[PDB]
Design a protein around this ligand. Sequence first.
Ligand SMILES: [Ca+2]
Lengths: 89, 106
Amino acid sequence: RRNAWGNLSYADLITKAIESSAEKRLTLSQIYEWMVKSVPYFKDKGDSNSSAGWKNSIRHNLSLHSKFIRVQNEGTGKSSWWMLNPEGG
Amino acid sequence: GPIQLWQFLLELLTDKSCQSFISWTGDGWEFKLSDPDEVARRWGKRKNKPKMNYEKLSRGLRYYYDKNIIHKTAGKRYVYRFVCDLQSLLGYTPEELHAMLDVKPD
DNA sequence: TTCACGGTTTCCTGTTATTGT
DNA sequence: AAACAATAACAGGAAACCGTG
Ligand SMILES: [Ca+2]
């Protein structure tokens, strides 16, 4: 039990969140919501803010890892889609 | 009107008892927030924003980059530089001001 | 008086550096 | 020695806020 939620890394979690989506892409906000709805540990960390230490870890994993790529989303608002790299770097 | 952040930092940088938490580096008008939480605390008290912290103070510093008031010294933690004409406002050179405040160089 | 504006303050998304496990 | 976690510095968009002219 390396982490509080199990042996999965953050990156493995985000991967599962994105793969769970119909279109194989989510916004950062949607990734946050998935974590809260889907990972028992995070179930009661829902109404917290981006300073949350684990939200920071998610942003941090999304930019650090080449397996995640950012894609722009249509109108105004309204942040990037996060998707897996077809190459998986 | 209300004092502006850059004027506030100047005020602290011209008072020698403030040197423990914010100081000139000795290179021009380059300065260091050596204790940024203490600097933010004072800024919060002065403006009556009790939740002021460095994260927020720094964001106001970042709006100054385009207004050529203050710039970041890249790769140096908490180091910034006035890039406006301070000599005219203060009536002193960097060298003059540094002597006055007994600035040990970095 | 009300109004519009500048200068933040607050929050956020995203990228990066560093240090501990 | 290499991966991952934790945490923070930093850039800059968006929008709220608020004192002043
Ligand atoms: Ca990435």
